[PDB]
Amino acid sequence: MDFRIGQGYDVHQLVPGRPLIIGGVTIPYERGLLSDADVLLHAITDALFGAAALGDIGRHFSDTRFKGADSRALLRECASRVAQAGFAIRNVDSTIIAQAPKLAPHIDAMRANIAADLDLPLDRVNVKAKTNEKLGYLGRGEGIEAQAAALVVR
Amino acid sequence: MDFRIGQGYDVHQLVPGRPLIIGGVTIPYERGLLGHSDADVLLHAITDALFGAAALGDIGRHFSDTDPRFKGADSRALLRECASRVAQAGFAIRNVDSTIIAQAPKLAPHIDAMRANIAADLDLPLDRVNVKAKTNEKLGYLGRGEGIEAQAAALVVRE
Amino acid sequence: MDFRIGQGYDVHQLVPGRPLIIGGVTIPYERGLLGHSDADVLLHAITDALFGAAALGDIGRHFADSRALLRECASRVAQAGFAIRNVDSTIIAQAPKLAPHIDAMRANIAADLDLPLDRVNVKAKTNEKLGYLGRGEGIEAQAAALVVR
Numbered sequence A: 001m002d003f004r005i006g007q008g009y010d011v012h013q014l015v016p017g018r019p020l021i022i023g024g025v026t027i028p029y030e031r032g033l034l035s036d037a038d039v040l041l042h043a044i045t046d047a048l049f050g051a052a053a054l055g056d057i058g059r060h061f062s063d064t065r066f067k068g069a070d071s072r073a074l075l076r077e078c079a080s081r082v083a084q085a086g087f088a089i090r091n092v093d094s095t096i097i098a099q100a101p102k103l104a105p106h107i108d109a110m111r112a113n114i115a116a117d118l119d120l121p122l123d124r125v126n127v128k129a130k131t132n133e134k135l136g137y138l139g140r141g142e143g144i145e146a147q148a149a150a151l152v153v154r
Numbered sequence B: 001m002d003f004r005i006g007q008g009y010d011v012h013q014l015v016p017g018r019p020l021i022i023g024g025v026t027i028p029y030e031r032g033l034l035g036h037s038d039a040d041v042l043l044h045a046i047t048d049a050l051f052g053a054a055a056l057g058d059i060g061r062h063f064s065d066t067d068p069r070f071k072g073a074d075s076r077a078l079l080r081e082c083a084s085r086v087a088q089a090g091f092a093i094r095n096v097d098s099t100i101i102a103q104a105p106k107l108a109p110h111i112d113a114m115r116a117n118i119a120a121d122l123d124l125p126l127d128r129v130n131v132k133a134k135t136n137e138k139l140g141y142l143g144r145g146e147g148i149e150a151q152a153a154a155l156v157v158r159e
Numbered sequence C: 001m002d003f004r005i006g007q008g009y010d011v012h013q014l015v016p017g018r019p020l021i022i023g024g025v026t027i028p029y030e031r032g033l034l035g036h037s038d039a040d041v042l043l044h045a046i047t048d049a050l051f052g053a054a055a056l057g058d059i060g061r062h063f064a065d066s067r068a069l070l071r072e073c074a075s076r077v078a079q080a081g082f083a084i085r086n087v088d089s090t091i092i093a094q095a096p097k098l099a100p101h102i103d104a105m106r107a108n109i110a111a112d113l114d115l116p117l118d119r120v121n122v123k124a125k126t127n128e129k130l131g132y133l134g135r136g137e138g139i140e141a142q143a144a145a146l147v148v149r
C-alpha cells in the first residue's frame, strides 16, 4: 500500500523541417517539434521519475550515452530505473494540447506504444486530446504541450 | 487495492453575449465562456480527469463537439453521465481536486456553491471535493482576461 | 485505505529588485518573484496541492514566510487526520539554472513536512522560449500530493 503519485509537464516549439512525433506516432504535418522532442512521452517520463522520487528527465537523459536515442527508448529506460527503485506502475493518464493537427485518430496508437513501453495492460494507460481554443502560443499553434500523471506502488 | 489517478485540463474564451457558468454556478458577469455546450470549464476538466482515471478516453470522445444534442448542454448533466460510465467500468470515485484560473470576476464567493454542485453530481460527501480559485498574476492571455482555465485531479478505485 | 490526491498551481512575475526564493532557497539572480509574501512559487503550489488533497481549500483561505506557511499547512493536514505519503512538483523557468538548487529545495520541503527525502521530488523545466515563461517574465510551479486518512 506504499502508493506514490507523479506529475509531468513538457512543451516544445512547432517548427518546419522536423517530423511530428507524439506518443511514438509520426503524424503527417507541415511542422514538427524541436531528442525526437516527443512531448507526450517526456511528460510521462517526468511523471514516472517524479513518482519514484528519482529527479527528472533532464538529469537522467541530458545532452551528454543516450545520443540519438528516441523518446520510446528513453521511456523504457525510465521504466527500468523505476522498477530497479522497487516500484510497480499502476496507471498513467495524460493530455496533449495542440490546436492542430487532429490527434483523436492517433490516440489508440499512442496508448499501445506507451502500454508496450511500460509493460502495462492497455486499460491502465490513457491519453486525452485538447485544443487551446485559439488562446495563447498553443492556440496560435506555436507549440504543443503535454501533461501527465502516474501512480506507482512500492 | 486497485487505485487509479486521472488529470484534466480545459480552457474557454471569454466573450460577450454568453452566460458565465463555472462549476454549475451561473455567475453575474458581462461576458461568458464560449463553447458548443454551456462551456463549463471546471466541470469539463473534472470530467476529463474522471474519464482519464478510468482509462475511458476523454470528454470529446464521450460527448462530441459536433452533435446538436450537446449544443448548449448542461455540463452538470454531462458530469453525471461521466460518473455513471466510470461506475459502469467498475470504478468508485474517491476524491476530486481542482483549480480555476481567471483575472475576473471574483470566484471566491462562488467556490462553496461549485463544490456543492460537484459533490451532488458525483454523489460524494463535501469533504471529498475541493475547488481552488486563482488569478494568473497578470500573466499571458489569462492575465489579459481573454479566457478562463481549469485544472483537475481525480482518484478512483476499481471495485 | 482512504487515499486522496491534490494538485497545486502557482505563478508569479519576475521583477527587479526582489530576491529569488524557490523551495525556500535564495538563488542569485537579477530579478525575483513578485507577491504579497516572499512569493515562493514552488512552496505555494505544494501548499495548495496538500490543502486540495485534504479538501481544506487553498492557502488564500487559511492565512510569516512560505516555509512557515508550509509548516502550518502540514499542521492543518494532520489535524484533519491525514498523513502525507508523497509530493511531486515541477518548476518552469527559462532562467536561471535550477538543477544545482533542487536538492536543497527538497531538503527544505522534507523538513517542513516531516517526510523522508525519498518521498519528496522537485523537477525543473524550461518553457522552450514559449510564452511569458519563455521570455522570462514569470516562473510557474506545479505540484501533486498524495495523502491518506
Ligand SMILES: Nc1ccn([C@@H]2O[C@H](COP(=O)(O)O)[C@@H](O)[C@H]2O)c(=O)n1
Pocket (backbone or CB within 6 Å): A056, A057, A058, A059, C092, C093, C094, C095, C096, C097, C098, C099, C100, C123, C124, C125, C126, C127, C128
Ligand atoms: N531553469 C531551469 C530549467 C531546467 N533546468 C534543468 O535542465 C534540464 C533540461 O530542461 P528542459 O528539458 O526543460 O529543456 C531539466 O531537466 C532541468 O533539470 C535547470 O537547471 N534550470
Ligand SMILES: Nc1ccn([C@@H]2O[C@H](COP(=O)(O)O)[C@@H](O)[C@H]2O)c(=O)n1
Pocket (backbone or CB within 6 Å): A097, A098, A099, A100, A101, A102, A103, A104, A105, A128, A129, A130, A131, A132, A133, B058, B059, B060, B061, B065
Ligand atoms: N489536437 C486535438 C485537440 C482535440 N481533439 C479532439 O477534439 C475534441 C475537441 O477538442 P477540445 O475539447 O480541445 O476542443 C477533443 O476531445 C479531442 O479529443 C483532437 O482530435 N485533436
Ligand SMILES: [Zn+2]
Pocket (backbone or CB within 6 Å): A010, A011, A012, A035, A037, A038, A039, A042
Ligand atoms: Zn521534451
Ligand SMILES: [Zn+2]
Pocket (backbone or CB within 6 Å): B010, B011, B012, B035, B039, B040, B041, B044, B045
Ligand atoms: Zn470545455
Ligand SMILES: [Zn+2]
Pocket (backbone or CB within 6 Å): C010, C011, C012, C035, C039, C040, C041, C044, C045
Ligand atoms: Zn504564490
